Amino acid sequence: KDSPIIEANGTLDELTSFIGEAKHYVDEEMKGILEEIQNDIYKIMGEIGSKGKIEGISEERIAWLLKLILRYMEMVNLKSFVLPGGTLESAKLDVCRTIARRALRKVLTVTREFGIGAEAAAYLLALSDLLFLLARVIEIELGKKLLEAARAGQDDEVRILMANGADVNAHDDQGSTPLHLAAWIGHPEIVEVLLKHGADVNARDTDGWTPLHLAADNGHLEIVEVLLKYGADVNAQDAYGLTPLHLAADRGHLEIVEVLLKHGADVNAQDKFGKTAFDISIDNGNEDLAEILQ
């Protein structure tokens, strides 16, 4: 009869329907999680419909939700605001999160009007946090599969995932972007297809290696020149102060050296140890490289 109670019940039932539509895009594990969440939401709906006469959820449910919160929190690294909807699954889950927030406001209003349902409000808040975490986890999983595809180097998974909205500039715990892996393995086509959609050529790993430094380290002319036409920093310095030309001279790639020189590389740059690329060439006894470097 009371309008707030009916509105809260309707909003919760909408929330459980949205959970139902979302639960068809996840694996078995999140599917089971969402099913027991449906069970708890139905319990809350039954409790509210009786004005607290029928016993509802128990504190074990909230403890379980907090356990899940911690479990998915250890596996996520939130650093800045992210645009919702990285992939279909994340978008569905975040929509469910917003509906959960609406139902949470409804339950809070009902509690303020009647003094019951505080545990339901806490459960819904935990549900909102859990859905946000699940969306971020799905995004991270897609990024990890993208990294796996880049390491494999055969581009079908790369393109299907990139079209699917997987984060292009996601990084491993080492800090390597898919561009870094593509440069390391030696599959350029992935490098171009990633660079087309705004891939940052100047990404920095935890080891100081940019994609261009490591790519030139492997002696891959094609990938390096593709990076250069895409605005690669010809004189970017690593964690040891090395420019691309220093590492180019380290393995004696004359063609890489001359390409870098054509694009503004500094022959006499200083690293942390003070070594210059020309002096590096002199040290190893290669004379044609020094002649080109001079």
Residue numbers in the entry: 23 to 316
Paper passage:
Here, we describe and detail the use of sub-particle CryoEM averaging and present updated reconstructions of DARP14, a multi-subunit tetrahedrally symmetric protein complex. Originally described by Liu and Gonen et al. (2018), DARP14 was computationally designed as a scaffold capable of displaying small proteins for CryoEM. DARPins are small, ~17 kDa helical repeat proteins that feature variable residue loops capable of selective non-covalent binding to other proteins, akin to antibodies. Variants of DARP14 and similar scaffolds have since been generated and used to bind and image small proteins, such as GFP and KRAS.
For the DARPin signal, we turned to sub-particle reconstruction coupled with signal subtraction. Therefore, for both the trimeric and subsequent monomeric reconstructions, extended parts of the core cage were kept intact to allow for sufficient signal to remain for classifications and local refinement. Stemming from the previous trimeric particle dataset, further subtraction and sub-particle reconstructions were made whereby each monomeric subunit was isolated. Using the same methodology as in the preceding run, the coordinates were shifted from the trimers to the center of each of the three monomers and combined, tripling the dataset. Since the monomers lack symmetry, our final reconstructions were therefore made using no applied (C1) symmetry. In contrast to the full complex, the resulting trimeric and monomeric DARPin maps feature vastly improved high-resolution information, particularly for the helical extension linker and residues close to the cage, facilitating model building and demonstrating the effectiveness of reducing the effect of high symmetry on averaging. The resolution range for both C3 and C1 was comparable; however, C3 DARPin information looked clearer closer to the core cage, while C1 DARPin looked clearer further away from the core cage. The latter residues of the DARPins remained at lower resolutions, likely owing to a significantly higher degree of flexibility in those regions and possible unwinding of the structure. All DARPin proteins displayed on the scaffold contain a single anchoring point, the extended helical linker. Several residues can be found in close proximity to the core cage, potentially allowing for non-covalent interactions and/or covalent disulfide bridges.
